[PDB]
């Protein structure tokens, strides 16, 4: 099974490592999302 | 565009509310998923040993 779980172990390691090592960058992403939500309601497609 | 737009500190407060709430939500949910990434690490470790 160990080679059958190649993609599986790869996802298990790298997804956590990406969301983790970028966890402050993901905090930034949360900030960008909540800003775009709360403030950018009334705007047209060029500005949105 | 000659279209009226306004702002208030209330929206800033609401924005902080959204930040706190959706952050605890996504932190806890995605970190239970990352806890499951660590469960994958546990599977790899137990298999190897």
Q: What is the resolution of this structure in A?
A: 8.8
Collect all residues of chain A within an 8 Å Cβ-Cβ radius of residue B29. none
Structure-determination approach: cryo-EM
Q: Which two tokens stand for residue B6?
A: 């306004």
Closest CA to A23 of B12, B37, B11, B43: B37
Asked whether the beta carbons of residue B15 and residue A1 sit closer than 8 angstroms, the reply is: no
Which residue in B11, B23, B30 is closest to A38 by CB distance?
Answer: B11
Question: In chain B, positions 28-47, which contact chain A (CB-CB < 8 Å)?
Answer: 30, 34, 37-38, 40-41, 43-44, 47
Which residue in A9, A34, A42 is closest to B5 by CB distance?
Answer: A42
User: Residue A9: CB partners within 8 Å, gap ≥ 6?
Assistant: B40, B44
Tell me the C-alpha to C-alpha distance, in Å, between residue B3 and each of A43, A45, B16, B20, B28.
10, 14, 27, 32, 40
- SS percent in chain B: helix, strand, coil, step 5: 80, 0, 20
């Amino acid at each position: 099974l160990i080679t059958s779980l190649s993609g599986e172990k790869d996802r298990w390691g790298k997804g956590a490592q990406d969301i983790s090592d970028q966890k402050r960058k993901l905090v930034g992403n949360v900030s960008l999302s909540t800003a775009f939500i709360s403030y950018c309601g009334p705007f047209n497609a060029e500005y949105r | 565009m000659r279209r009226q737009v306004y702002v208030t500190p209330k929206s800033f407060l609401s924005y902080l509310n959204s930040y706190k709430t959706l952050y605890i939500e996504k932190y806890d949910e995605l970190d239970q998923q990352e806890e499951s990434f660590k469960i994958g690490l546990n599977k790899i470790q137990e298999a190897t040993i």
